[PDB]
Every structure is written in structure tokens, then in C-alpha cells.
Design an enzyme around this catalytic site. Structure first.
Site, PDB file in Angstrom:
ATOM      1  N   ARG A   1       1.583   8.500  12.768  1.00 54.92           N
ATOM      2  CA  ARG A   1       1.296   9.766  13.417  1.00 54.92           C
ATOM      3  C   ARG A   1      -0.184  10.128  13.416  1.00 54.92           C
ATOM      4  O   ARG A   1      -0.707  10.601  14.423  1.00 54.92           O
ATOM      5  CB  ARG A   1       2.100  10.887  12.746  1.00 54.92           C
TER       6      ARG A   1
ATOM      7  N   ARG B   1     -11.272   5.821   8.305  1.00 53.59           N
ATOM      8  CA  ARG B   1     -10.100   5.342   7.577  1.00 53.59           C
ATOM      9  C   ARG B   1      -9.209   4.492   8.483  1.00 53.59           C
ATOM     10  O   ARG B   1      -8.857   4.909   9.586  1.00 53.59           O
ATOM     11  CB  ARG B   1      -9.283   6.525   7.038  1.00 53.59           C
TER      12      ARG B   1
ATOM     13  N   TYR C   1       0.830  -1.191   0.000  1.00 55.34           N
ATOM     14  CA  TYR C   1       0.000   0.000   0.000  1.00 55.34           C
ATOM     15  C   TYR C   1       0.879   1.261   0.000  1.00 55.34           C
ATOM     16  O   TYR C   1       0.623   2.211  -0.747  1.00 55.34           O
ATOM     17  CB  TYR C   1      -0.922   0.022   1.222  1.00 55.34           C
TER      18      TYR C   1
ATOM     19  N   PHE D   1      15.499  19.339  -0.523  1.00 53.35           N
ATOM     20  CA  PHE D   1      14.171  18.820  -0.795  1.00 53.35           C
ATOM     21  C   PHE D   1      13.979  17.396  -0.266  1.00 53.35           C
ATOM     22  O   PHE D   1      12.920  17.058   0.258  1.00 53.35           O
ATOM     23  CB  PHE D   1      13.913  18.851  -2.307  1.00 53.35           C
TER      24      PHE D   1
HETATM   25  C1  LIG Z   1      13.067  10.274  -2.601  1.00 55.29           C
HETATM   26  O1  LIG Z   1      12.979  11.290  -1.598  1.00 55.29           O
HETATM   27  C2  LIG Z   1      11.734  11.993  -1.730  1.00 55.29           C
HETATM   28  C3  LIG Z   1      10.536  11.169  -1.284  1.00 55.29           C
HETATM   29  N1  LIG Z   1       9.508  12.217  -1.071  1.00 55.29           N
HETATM   30  C4  LIG Z   1       8.184  12.071  -1.097  1.00 55.29           C
HETATM   31  C5  LIG Z   1       7.608  10.806  -1.142  1.00 55.29           C
HETATM   32  C6  LIG Z   1       6.235  10.690  -1.333  1.00 55.29           C
HETATM   33  C7  LIG Z   1       5.478  11.845  -1.492  1.00 55.29           C
HETATM   34  C8  LIG Z   1       4.069  11.766  -1.725  1.00 55.29           C
HETATM   35  C9  LIG Z   1       2.863  11.719  -1.911  1.00 55.29           C
HETATM   36  C10 LIG Z   1       1.405  11.672  -2.105  1.00 55.29           C
HETATM   37  O2  LIG Z   1       1.056  10.576  -2.967  1.00 55.29           O
HETATM   38  C11 LIG Z   1       0.750  11.493  -0.742  1.00 55.29           C
HETATM   39  N2  LIG Z   1      -0.267  12.532  -0.517  1.00 55.29           N
HETATM   40  C12 LIG Z   1       0.370  13.857  -0.487  1.00 55.29           C
HETATM   41  C13 LIG Z   1       1.175  14.107  -1.753  1.00 55.29           C
HETATM   42  C14 LIG Z   1       0.912  12.970  -2.727  1.00 55.29           C
HETATM   43  C15 LIG Z   1      -0.591  12.856  -2.936  1.00 55.29           C
HETATM   44  C16 LIG Z   1      -1.245  12.480  -1.615  1.00 55.29           C
HETATM   45  C17 LIG Z   1       6.099  13.089  -1.434  1.00 55.29           C
HETATM   46  C18 LIG Z   1       5.356  14.251  -1.620  1.00 55.29           C
HETATM   47  C19 LIG Z   1       5.659  14.851  -2.837  1.00 55.29           C
HETATM   48  C20 LIG Z   1       6.596  15.876  -2.890  1.00 55.29           C
HETATM   49  C21 LIG Z   1       6.902  16.485  -4.102  1.00 55.29           C
HETATM   50  C22 LIG Z   1       6.270  16.068  -5.270  1.00 55.29           C
HETATM   51  C23 LIG Z   1       5.324  15.052  -5.218  1.00 55.29           C
HETATM   52  C24 LIG Z   1       5.012  14.451  -4.004  1.00 55.29           C
HETATM   53  N3  LIG Z   1       7.422  13.166  -1.221  1.00 55.29           N
HETATM   54  C25 LIG Z   1      10.183  13.535  -1.020  1.00 55.29           C
HETATM   55  C26 LIG Z   1      11.641  13.175  -0.786  1.00 55.29           C
HETATM   56  O3  LIG Z   1      11.822  12.743   0.570  1.00 55.29           O
END
Ligand SMILES: CO[C@H]1CN(c2ccc(C#C[C@@]3(O)CN4CCC3CC4)c(Cc3ccccc3)n2)C[C@H]1O
Lengths: 335, 335, 334, 332, 334, 335
Positions: free
Chosen positions: B183, B193, B136, B253
Site C-alpha cells: 500500500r 525506503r 524481513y 482486536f
Molecule cells: C495475531 O493477530 C495480530 C497481529 N497484529 C499485529 C501484527 C503486527 C503488528 C506490528 C508492528 C510494528 O512492529 C510495526 N510498526 C507499527 C507497530 C509496531 C512498531 C512499528 C501489530 C501492531 C501491534 C498492535 C498491538 C500491539 C503491538 C503491535 N499488530 C494484530 C493482530 O492482527
């Protein structure tokens, strides 16, 4: 991957309050080298601290500790201190020590020998002169700053100069040790230990333990400011030393503890609390709020900010007031 | 001067609490590519959460969402969710997606296609085994880490290896998602949920909702600590992944959100407040106070600090106590 | 181990509450050069502000200030300012100035001269238009940003390209000054001088002192937002200017002051306290609590967080709202 | 795998570009495709301008609206008889990739195409007369290109914002290359019925520009050749200033190498009768290439001395030539 | 001032016509580590090529060569090959090997071990399929590119990402090896050695030696062009691998030999002379002579000019014409 | 826009076929300083070489030349040399000399003073021993190497070490001078000047002019290889010297002439053509072609290739064969 090495790091986090984190963040061979190095010194130090160990039996141990590093079976089961498992399970430690590149163990063992000599020496006496305060701090911390620098230059992560300037490296060790000595007066006193220099505190009271007495709080603080002013003189070397590092992981390992110490001196300055309990690390002004100690220019700004916190609180009639402004003025102008 | 691009950033800021800043701080090409990637995923999630949408109608939308990116006029007007604006004004977002270089387009669309598949798959079920939990998390977050990694590599700002090592990229996502799921236990409860893995909580209570009841707080915290222990297994991969980054804006980032997630797990470990509402992110130990998560060595130090904060609070009775020490030990010794 | 140099640094710390540390952290020859540069400009500002000095005696002193730099024995003991020690003991400062390399001296003198001329100009007039407000700011801050840039390149710690970009270097100055002015309204009201452009406030109330009147708090806050919006237009240049830097000590020096100023504006935006008292650099978001102003990407993130802290508070009432969102939008897509 | 349209564009680039395909393809990241596409649209525009089978009446509207055809997906031109006509017949493929570039790049390119179209149309009925007019023509077909390229470098952030702002220096980069080519292509053009040398200059030597093709005027031809080259040399100080501001290696290579080759071409053509009979053939250097500023300066200085010691005292530009070369030599 | 090290560099220059100079130019520790690495591979290769050593005697030598590095007195006195001095005086070489830092010893020994197994595996057979061609080239060169990369990272002169990318490091080796194998057709045929993949040449002739026959020149050039087209497929990886490098000495070491190989393929493409002797690298389009192979953008340009030289000579009738255009298109476009 | 300064640059280009370009390409203050330095030395050399100037008149001119730099109107109108223009218009050059920062003046004048004395010392003699060859070369070229190095360090474009290590600076000059002397044997012979060391050539023939005799070609080439072998000994210092340069314009200036000299020696080694006229650029190899002399590693590789071009030609029967292999071997294995 080792199970013994996994144990060494468990001990590092068990006995170290301020270094496990930055040690583990060190690059390559320094990680295990510094880690092990810290563990042997801890065990050694745990020996000098155990007062249940007769002076006739302790002198040997301190003097020949560096030799137990090569005795796979050696250990000590007759200790009552809180960090005993490093002596009782010292074999695990010595083992990993032997797994280090020779050059690294040629440094760690040399320091263990030389430290054990100084420590034994001060076993039957207290610090009298300021010159003897340096000397004592040299034996228990100065040589560690020297030993760490040589490890850095040996791994080649840092230029050979770092390891060559034993003077600057010595200051690095002295500043941390003096800072902790100053800050832990009450704790040390309540433990029967005396580290403050008699030629400095005897000008204020009959005996060092008097500073724990509330009627002497004003004299105590005055002595505190004199000792802090003394320690401040090492800052110039700290900056010079820090400004020569090039490896990021080494810089953090070095800079962070120093900045934390300077921060501690600023909090302890003219603070009666030093004689009632423990002191709390005041973060810097509104400027430092937006900066950490991982780059030289920022470490400089942070230090200068901590100097002004001290300078601004200097009492006009403090016997050392003049001296305090002098060294701080020197720190502001030196480059 | 593009009104549509400006509108996208307006949307980015209106929906992203913790990512807008670091996203807009990315160098050159990655800026718009990552901003748009976030918005499309944001729109997908909005559809996925809309309970006023019948399953029979939602499945094909999640399945076909990726195709709407190429349909100029596609939009969704029947959503009541808060962020519904990105759905009603999807043409503005899809338009900017089509303005991105083709290499970024293919990555985003591909990830959207696969995420929709997985989201629809979990619409009629809850998480059972810990393996389903990973599956998931993979679908809604792991794939995102992989997608971002592919954008970083495709932009040349980062090494080809970052996009290639999908397992490490996947771990970045799982750790964040698991952390948020852990969390947000209560908030999700008051929403119908259930994300905590059945095969885990069914060993403490017979109804996940029972953890909100305090006759079980002691059991609820045992479950809490087990899941957190599970989540900690991703940290080694997180360290490995971050260690490969070389572009400062990308490093910021990636690292900052990960460090915040680790801080969060440490603030939830063996903490009863998790089941009573929101929790706060206590700063980092004395040392951490002097360290920003903007360089690898510093990020390591910070991560280790938090590990010990958790290690120090491990109750000998907690059923996962020894696993929690095991993983923490593996993290601290592993170089 | 110079006596006069130690004294200059004593005055640096004495007069500056927020630049001392970053100046002392500058690399090599920039250290003393910028320190000295700050002290002279400090002395110069001290004159302009001292109202006991006649309008006929002041003008000359402003115009010739740059020459006093080469006149060793020049001093000034007829000032009532709190920072008069710099004037009274100016020789100590002029001396060290003369010890600087020729390249640094040139720059500093030129700016003092041009600043002097400018300051004199606004001794009889007032800040009327926004264009006029830029003019003043250019004189008291804008030119300083240029001087600093030139010193950076002259020191060669920074690329020649830095000193060349006078247009954005000037913006660096304009942004800080407009910020200080906006934040120091009351203190300047209860002081005698007004720096807020009449053209802007005159469309709100009849007298600048009227903002201090609680019965106008509304009009007050609105004029406030309007000016802040004006200052925000400099952020793009600030970002571009900072992006160019390559020396860590120079970046820290340039970036921290700018970021604090942005934090300042975010605290003042739509805030009544700007008229009752002074404001606090309220904490930032959760993310910002992670980073600090020492690397460009982190500085961008911090800026974006303050822009959102402001944007989300914009009341669609404000005659400025439309413009406030417009500039922030531009700042977000850069 | 990805975009076959882009592959077709690089095919055309190598097909139509004799001197830039390699350095364009070597540009970092975004500049690569942006500069490639920029070269291709300019190439199509130039093919239309140069096609003499298209009447002036029919041509002007095409030149004026070319910048807009970039946004007309199916537009193309099937009536060109020029050798590079494939870029016009398959323009859709090129404009397609033009539209895939980030908008900030499209803006710059369309703007240059618009202004260039206007300038080209303006010169279809008139010849180049004055030297001031020669600069104007060169500005339209090349100066604006240097300006365009500079704006792309700044917009990409690979170069300082200054590069794109200093339009005078960028303009000089273009003029130097165009004047050089015009000087070198005298014969080829005369045989094509096209005249580019300024009338106010060549008229002081002969009555008809085509006369320089005549041997009996060779001496007068060479004298004119030398005056023009002398004119072209005035852009060098700007070229040097421009290159000295570059910080991106790929961009530096792309900007300097072409400029050096042009300088090598002028040195080889100076006081050379060959310019009028056939094609012209291009020691400390040989240990250095044009990829770092000091080396580029050295190469340029060597070429300047090659021209300098070859200056005929009898030549009427003799003093003008020495003055500008001395000026370049002493320039900081 | 070691006399044994002095002898190793003497051997390096006696055996390497095209690597000694760039190897001696490597910074610090890489210098000796790569020199030794080159020498031990030279010895192993001489053993593999000596046809006077029976297969049953050769297999153990190849298999255990890596262990010989730790046998101070080990050497081989029965070779008739031209470079046999490194085998007869191997102790001098193994001594300097044992003087190298442990981190370098480990990488070198590991590559010798693995290469030993691969060479032994191919003693009883000729390369059949193109997949087999890659495997053989991997064993004798791909592993060397991988070994070299690990040495660079181990020295810290290069980022760890360099040694970690085994895929592209491997391509660096395959490219040089395939190029040499293509170029040396004749020289190998006259030596009784066949390296051109059977599944490829058997589609043109009955026997690989038939390409040496004038009446088959046409079928020979076609096979030549098909093999070259195959080799061109590694260039993207070569460019990617070279773009990652940050140390100038390492860059020159890796880039120059690759560029010379690229120049060689261009010279051999559709060139009948390949089957009548060796071929001359002359080459150089306009741009070329104004830029050498010491910075990445220049290397790219040089490669692009060579690709154009080949592309412009592609015959319609050639069976690989389309494939040759495809790969070059891919190189110039991405 | 100084008319005297451009006249100086006119003279530089007019009198220097191989240094004008790299000098002009020098950064900031080094540009004019080196241009002026070259002109004054060119003038001094023009006096020394003019055979129509009596020894009586020449000695005072060489000894006092350095002082003429300070005399606004000094000039010399009796030269019959081709470059006499620099002497007749010396006030223009000296004017510019005096406009240079005092620190550069100190260097240039010092070198002219020392060179003046050395040239005067050799008007009455030929070169005898190899020790004397070094001395002569020191005076006319080595001192220039030292002077140039001091200008680099004074300007601060290079570290103080460049200016302090006079031995390595001297080697740069000796190498170039010895190479020119070897290459110009025949030209000098037809000129009446002898530079080849008498203690070396006398061991082959009666008079230096005999090497031009077709019958002594074998002996001549042998001598040639001995002198070349002598020159090769400076190469290690040339590599050491160049490896310390940090400024690109300075590197180009110093490296190009050095590499060109090395190519010349390689071309002359064991080459009979040296005694029938001039020789030139043996165009390198296959590796060389692909690299220019603008970065140190490349310069090293280029130098090592030329060393091998020489090594490959050493005939076992040459009297110096072993010496030639030895120094080359030393050059190969030195880090
Ligand atoms: C590999 O390192 C990277 C891994 N990162 C992540 C990982 C997963 C996500 C996400 C997501 C989501 O699917 C969950 N939720 C919130 C944002 C999307 C839509 C519903 C996000 C959020 C996200 C940030 C920027 C663009 C897209 C999604 N970030 C940021 C860095 O730590």
C-alpha cells in the site's frame, strides 16, 4: 482438497451474486451441502429459462432433473444461456452431490423433483391469482426455504423444529422470491417474462407490459405498492423463523438475505425508479448505522426501521394505503 | 490513578492510528500488557527509522533495546522523529513494563530482543528474494503476531494452542506488513525506503523508483498484482488463526485489523492509483453492508466478498493471473 | 392481535424518533412494558412542556399523574402540544398499562410519581448550579434509567444485580439528558426554556440568549466545551453499567442510545454550529466503520474513538482543556 | 523457569494455612496470586501481634508501619519466636511478590493492612469488654479482610462492582468466621494467656474467664458458649445475601466453603461441654457440596435445625436462639 | 431398543468397574460411541494379554484388529482370559460399531490401528527407559485420551480445540496408565507381567521381582516414590485439559477418573502396602467433603489437597525428595 | 416479617426431617407455595393416620379437608398424634395458604381434594394387587409428584412440560413411596399397618407378619426382591423427569430425595437385615464419593452405580432374577 469440488465453488461464485459468501461461511457439512444444492437448482433453473428449448423437449428435463443427479455421465450441451457450464460440466457437479451424506442428498433430490414438477406446470401459463403467485413462488423458492431448513435440521446444527415447520420455511422462500419479482419487473419484462399476478395488475392496465410505458407510471407505482404490501405479510414468519436459529453461521446465511430483501422493498416502495431501471439499497437510519444483521435483536431493530421508512412514505390516496398501515401495524405489535 | 499508566495510554493514542481503540478494549490483563507491548515496539521502530543516527551507533541500540526495559533511567534524547516522546520519556513506559506480570514481561522482552536483531540485520541491505521479504516481515511483524499470541495464551483468555502455533501467528503479522508495504509504495519512495522485493520488481524495471514513472505504470501494476498475489497466500492461515479465538475483545482486536488489510489489498489490486498516492477502502458488497467483523462466520463472508472483488478484476493478460485465481480458489473451497 | 396495543405502538413510532425500533426488539415481556413505559412518560413530559396550562393547574396534574394510570376514563383534551394524541387518548394507554404484570406496573408508577414531584419543583425555579443541573436531569432522565434497570431485572431477562445498581443506572439517564440539553440549546432558546446551568454560563455572559448572539460565538463555544466536559464524567459509569448486561436485546437497547449520545457530544465539542443550527453525527474513524454497538468490546472501541476525536481537538486555550483531557485520560485507563 | 519467589510464597501459604491454601490456589487468574499474597502479609502481621515477647512499646510502631514495610524491599523481622516466624524472616520474598501485583490490588491490600495495624495496636492494652467492642475487634482482624477480599473481587472484574461496595455484608463475612474461631478456641487461648470472649458476657457467669476451664462451672460455661454462638448466628443472613451475589465459580467456592465450615463448627459446639475440655469433632446433605447457592442454603438450614432441636429450654438464650434461627429460616 | 446395543452395555458393565457409569452419563451420541470404543479396546487388550497366543500369531491379530471392525463375522474363540466374552461375541460389538456415525468410526478405527502396532512392538521386550515408558503408555492409553477427545469434538458437544490438543489429551492417558501400573505392581508381578521401567528399578534391585521381597521394602518404597514423582508431572496438563471442557457430562467423564487416580497416587506415596497387596482410597482433608469433582475450581482444590497430603509425607532421605517437592510446588504455584 | 409465615416454617422443620432444607432453598415464589403444600399434606396425613379418630368422623375429614383451606377458623383439637400442632393451629397454615397467588391455590387444593378421596377409599381395605399398590401410592405420593410439578410450571421456573407430563410426575412419587414402604416393613408391622401388596406376599406366606419370623427369612427376601424389582421400573421416568429440570433449586429439591431412595433400595436389595430392623447409606463407590447430586450427568452416574450394586447381587436362584436384570438392562441402554 478435491479438484472437482474446487470447480463447484468456482461455479458458485460465477453464478451467484448474493449467496456464495454466506454459503462458504457455513459450518461443517452445510458448506458443501448448501453449495451443491445451489448449483443443482441453478442448472435446473437455467433449463426453464432457456426458451430455445422446445416445450416438448423441456418438460422431460424438468421432470427428470432429479434423476440426472445419479447419472454420472449426464449433462446438457444444447443450452445458450449464460450459466451453461453448470449443465455442460454437470458431471463435476453431480459427482460432488453423490459425495454428500445420503440424508443431505435425500433432501436435495426430493426438492429437485418437486420443483421440476411445479416449473413444468407453469411452463404454459402466467400467474393469475394471488393464490397462484404464492403457488408459483412455492415451486421455485418456497421449496428451497423448506429444503434448506431440512438440511439444517439434518446436520443437527439446528433443532429439528426448523425443518418441521415447512410453513415458516416456506415464507422465508416466498419473501425473497416476491421481492426479486417486484424489483425485476423491467428486466423480466424486457426479457419477455411475466411474473406479476394478472388478477392484481389487470385492475390497473390492459396488459402487464404497459407498466414499462411512461404514461402509466402512476398506475404502475400503485400496483407496485400493492404487491409490496402483499410481500410484507411474510415478514412475521421471517422473524419467527430467524428467532429460532442457534448456529451463528446459519443465522447469517438466513438473516442477511432476508434483511437485504426487506431493504430492497423499502427502497422500491412508491418508487418510480422501479420502472425506469435498477434500485439502490438505502442503508437504514442513523440508528441502524450502528448495527449489522448478525444477532436477532439487531435484525429486529433493522426490520422495524425499514418498516417506518415505508410507513412514513405511504401516500394517503394510494388504494392500498390502508392495507399497508395494517400489516406494518401488525409487524410493530407482534412479538 | 497511576500517572505513569495514564501517560502510557496518552502515548498509545498519540501514536496508534488504527490500534489504540481495540487495544484499550481488551479484557482485564491484556489491556496494559498489549498497550505496553505496542509502546516499546513503537519506541524501537522510532530508533530504527531515525536516519540521523549513525549505523555504528544504531545497531547496538536495536540489539540492546530489550535490555533498556529493565534499566529504570534509560532514555534516548537525540531523536528528531515525530514520536520521539516515547524515547525521551522511556522511563515512564519501561516502568509500566516492569509492573506487568512476569509472564508478560518475558514475552515482550524476548520478542524485542529478536526483533532488534532482525532490524539491525536489514539496515545495510534491501529485500532481495521473496524469502528475504518473508524474513524481513517476520522480524518486524510476524514476531509481533507470535508475541501477542503468547500474551493471549499466557493470560488464559485464549487457548494454549494460540500461543503454540507460531506459524499461524507469524502469518497474521506477515499479511499486515506485506499489505502495508504494498500500500505504501509511493510514500516510502519519497523517503529513500525500498521494501518491495528486488527479485520481483527487477523483472519489470531496473530501478524500483521507475514504478513511480508512468512510462511504466502498466508494468508497475503487473508487479503490484504479483506481490498482492503473494500476500494472499497468508489468508488461509489468517482464517485458521481467527477461528481459534474465543474471547470477544481479543477477536475484535485480531479480526478487525486483518479485515481492513484485506479490504486494502482489494482496493489496490490492478489499481493505478497506488502509484499516484493514497487509496480508499471502498465498503464491502451489498451483503457486507450488513456485517461487522465481530463473529467468525461474518468475518469469513467478508473475506470471501473481497476475494471475489479481486477475482472479478483479474486481467487475463496479467502474468500472475492464474496464480491469483489459484490462491483465491484455494481460499474459497478450503473449509 | 389486540387493538389498543397496536395503537400504543402507533404512538410509540409517532412520538419517538430513536427508541421505537430498539424497544420493539426487546425480549418477551420487556417489549410492551418498556413501550408503555415510554408512552406514559411521554404524555407526562407533554404536560410539563405545554405552557398554556396554568402554573396552578399544572402542578396538580404532575403530582397525580401516576394515579391517572389506574383511572380508566382519565384524559386531557386541553393541550396544544404536537404529541397531544397521547393525552387525548390516554385511556388506550392506561388500559394496556393495566394489562402489564404487577411487577412492571409497580416500577412504572413509582417513577412517574417521583418524576412528577420533581418536575413540579422546577416549574418556578431555574437550573442554577451543576449540582442543580444533576437534580433536574435526575428527575427527567436519571429516574428513567433506574426504572428501566428495574424492569430488566423484574423481567428476569437480566440479573437482579442490574436493577440494584441505581447509582449507575441514574448516570445512564444523566448522560443522555445533559447531551440532549447541550445539543438542543438554540431550539430551546427559540422556544422559551433554558436548561443550561446559570452558574456555568453566568461566568461567560449575562444572558443565556446572549450565546445566540454571533458577537459572543467565542464565549459560546467555550461554555459549550465546559458543559460537555461535565457530561463526559458519566462515561465510566455508562461503560461499567453496560458491561454488566447479559441479554442481547437489553444490551442493544441500552448501548445504542448511549453511543449515539457520545457521537453527539463528539460532534458538538468546540463546534459553532451548536449555536447557528443543529449538528450531524459525523462519520467515525476507519476502525469504527468496521464495528457496531452490539457487543461490549466493540462499544468500548467506539467510545475510545470518539474520546480521541474530541481529545485531539482540545484547544489549550479553553478554561476546560485541562479538565477535558483529565476525564478522557481516566476514561482511557479504565 | 519463571518466579521462584512466587513458588516460595505458595510454599508458605500451605505451611501457614490450615484451611485456605486449596481454595485460594483454585481462584481464577489474577485473584489467585493477589489473594495468596494478601493471606501471607496478613499472616505476618498477625504473627507480630500475637508474639508476646515483643513489648507493647516496641510492637505498636511495627503494627502501625507494617503497611509501609510492604514497600521496603529489604525489611524483615528476625526476633520473632512464633511458629510462623518464617514469613517475617523471609518477608522480602513476600513483599517482592506483593509489589509485582497490579497496582489496583496493592492499593486494596496496603489499605487493609494499614487499618488493621491501627486496630490491632488499639487493642494491645485493653481487653474485649462489650459486645459492641467484640464486633470492633473482629472488624479489625477479620471484617476488614472480608471487605478487602470483596474489593479485590470487584477490582478484578470477576464479580460485580456491588460486591466490593457493600462493606456491611463483606464485614459480616469476616465477623462470622472470626467469632466462630474465637468461640471454638476458648481453651487453646486460655492456655495461651489470651482472652477474646467479651468480658461483659462471661462476667455474668463467672469472675475470671479462666473459670470456664473448671468443670465445676461447666454448666455456666456451656450457657455462655450458647449465648456467644447465638450472637454469631446473627451474621448468617448477611452471609447468605453475600454469597447469593457471587457469579464466579472459583470465587463462590472460596467464599462459601469457609463459611459453611464455620457454620458446621458452631452447630457442633452449641450446647456442647467439649468446647471446654478438649477439641471438638465436626443426612440429606451428603448428596450435596457447597458449590451452588441453593445447596449452600440447604446445608445451612440443616445445620440450623441441628442447633434448633438441641436448644435447652432451661438455657437463658433459648428464646434468642430460636428467634434468630427462625429469622434465618423465613428470610427471602 | 436394539438387542445388540443392549448386549454391548451389558458387556460394558461386566468389564468396566470404573467407567460404565460415567460413560452411560454422556450426552447424546457420545454415549454409544464411547461405550463401543471402550469395548473394542477391551477386546484388543485381552488379545495383547493372552499369553496362550504365540507371538507370531499375536502380531497379526494386533496389527489387523482395526480391520476386524469391518468383518461382520470375525471373532476369536481361543482366549482363556477373563473378559474373552467380548472377543467371542465380537460380531455383536462390531455391528454396533458399524452403526455409529462415520465420524466416530473413523476415530475409533484409527486408534485401534495405531494401538495395534504399538502393542505388537512391545511384545518382544520390557519397558527400559522412562522415554520408553511414555511411549508404551502412549500406545495403550495416551492414544485413547486422544481418541476420546476427537470423539467429543466430532459430536460438537465439545469445542474443536479439545480434539485438536493431542499433547494434553495424551497426558490425560499417560497419567491414568502410569498410576495403574504403579498401583498394580504386585498383581502384575504375580502374573508374569513387568511394566515398571527397567532403567529405573535396576538402580534399586537386580530383579523387578525383588521388590516383592520384604528385605527390600525400603529400596522398593524409594522406587515407588520415584515413579510417582514421574507421574505427578502430567498433572499440569491434566488441569489445563480439564479447564478447556464446556459440556458437563464430558467434564465428569474426564475429571472423575483423573481425580481418582490422583487420590490413588497419594494413597500409594511412600506406602509399603503397595508391595503387599492393593491400596485403599479413603482420603479427604477438611475442604474435600464439602465439594465434589463436578466443577473446575473444586477439582483444582481437591487436587491441591491431595498434593499437600503427599508433600507433607515426603521423607528427607528419599532420593526423589527434592524432585517430588519441585513438581508439587509447580502444581500449586502455576 | 410475618409471624404466621415463620410459625409455618417452624412447623415445617419440626415435622420434616428430610425436606425442610431443600424446600427452604427453593427460589422465589416456589419457597412458600411448597412449604404450605407440605404442611397441609402433613395435616391431612396426621388425620388419616390417627387411629383414635373413628371411621365415621374420618371419612368426612378426608373428603372435605381441601375445603378447610378456605375456612379461616377451621381447626381440629382431638388429634392424639405427635404432629397434632399443625391441626390445632390450622388457621395459621390456612391463612398463609390463602395468601399464595391464586394459581398455586388451585394446585394445592386440587391435590388435597383428590388425595382426601383416595385415602377415604382405603380406610376399609388393604392393598391387594400390584395395580392397587400403584393406586394407593398414586393417592398418597404420586399426586404429590404431580402437584409439585404443577407448582414448578405455574411459577415459570420450569417449562410447562414439567406440569403437563403427569405420568412422569406420578412416577417420581410412586418411586419414593414404594421405597419407603419396602424399607419400613418391620416398623409398620409392629404398628399394625400393612402396605406390602397381598397378591405378592401371599405367594410366599400365609400372613404378611410371617416375614418377621426367622424361619421365613428366605421367602421374605425373595418377596423383598420382587417388590424392589417392581419399584425399579419407575427409574426411567425419574431420569426423564430430572433431565428436564432447568432451575438449580428445583433440581436439588427433586433429585436429592430420589437419589436417596435409590441408595436405600440398593442397600435393601437381597438384604436379610430388612426384616430385623432398619438399614442405611451403603456409602457409594469410588466414583460416587467424588460427585454430588446437583447436576444431571452426575445424578445419572450415581443412579447407574447403584443399579450395578444391585445387579452384582442378583442371585441366579431368586425368583425375580431375570426381571431384575431386565429392567436394569433397560435402564442402562436407554439414552
Ligand atoms: C495475531 O493477530 C495480530 C497481529 N497484529 C499485529 C501484527 C503486527 C503488528 C506490528 C508492528 C510494528 O512492529 C510495526 N510498526 C507499527 C507497530 C509496531 C512498531 C512499528 C501489530 C501492531 C501491534 C498492535 C498491538 C500491539 C503491538 C503491535 N499488530 C494484530 C493482530 O492482527
Amino acid at each position: 482438497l478435491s479438484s472437482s469440488l474446487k470447480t463447484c465453488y468456482k461455479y458458485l461464485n460465477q453464478t451467484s451474486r448474493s449467496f456464495a459468501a454466506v454459503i462458504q461461511a457455513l459450518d461443517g457439512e452445510m458448506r458443501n451441502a448448501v453449495c451443491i444444492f445451489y448449483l443443482v437448482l441453478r442448472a435446473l433453473d437455467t433449463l426453464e429459462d432457456d426458451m430455445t428449448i422446445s416445450v416438448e423437449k423441456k418438460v422431460p428435463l424438468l421432470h427428470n432433473f432429479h434423476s440426472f443427479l445419479y447419472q454420472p455421465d449426464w449433462r446438457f450441451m444444447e443450452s445458450k444461456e449464460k450459466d451453461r457450464q453448470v449443465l455442460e460440466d454437470f458431471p463435476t457437479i453431480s459427482l460432488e452431490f453423490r459425495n454428500l451424506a445420503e440424508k443431505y442428498q435425500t433432501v436435495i433430490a426430493d426438492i429437485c423433483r418437486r420443483m421440476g414438477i411445479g416449473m413444468a406446470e407453469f411452463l404454459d401459463k402466467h400467474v393469475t391469482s394471488e393464490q397462484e403467485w404464492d403457488k408459483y413462488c412455492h415451486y421455485v423458492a418456497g421449496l428451497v426455504g423448506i429444503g434448506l431448513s431440512r438440511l439444517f435440521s439434518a446436520s443437527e446444527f439446528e433443532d429439528p423444529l426448523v425443518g418441521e415447520d415447512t410453513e415458516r420455511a416456506n415464507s422465508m422462500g416466498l419473501f425473497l422470491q416476491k421481492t426479486n419479482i417486484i424489483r425485476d419487473y423491467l428486466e423480466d419484462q424486457q426479457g419477455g417474462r411475466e411474473f406479476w399476478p394478472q388478477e392484481v395488475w389487470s385492475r390497473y392496465v390492459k396488459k402487464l407490459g404497459d407498466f414499462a410505458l411512461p404514461e402509466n407510471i402512476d398506475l404502475a407505482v400503485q400496483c407496485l405498492n400493492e404487491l409490496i404490501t402483499n410481500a410484507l405479510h411474510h415478514i412475521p414468519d421471517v422473524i419467527t423463523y430467524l428467532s429460532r436459529l442457534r448456529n451463528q453461521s446459519v443465522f447469517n446465511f438466513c438473516a442477511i438475505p432476508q434483511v437485504m430483501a426487506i431493504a430492497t422493498l423499502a427502497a422500491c416502495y412508491n418508487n418510480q425508479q422501479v420502472f425506469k431501471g435498477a434500485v439502490l439499497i438505502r442503508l437504514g437510519q442513523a440508528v441502524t448505522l450502528m448495527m449489522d444483521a448478525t444477532n436477532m435483536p439487531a435484525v429486529k431493530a433493522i426490520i422495524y426501521q425499514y418498516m417506518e421508512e415505508i410507513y412514513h412514505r405511504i401516500p394517503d390516496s394510494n388504494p392500498s394505503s390502508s392495507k399497508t398501515r395494517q400489516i406494518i401495524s401488525t409487524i410493530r405489535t407482534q412479538n
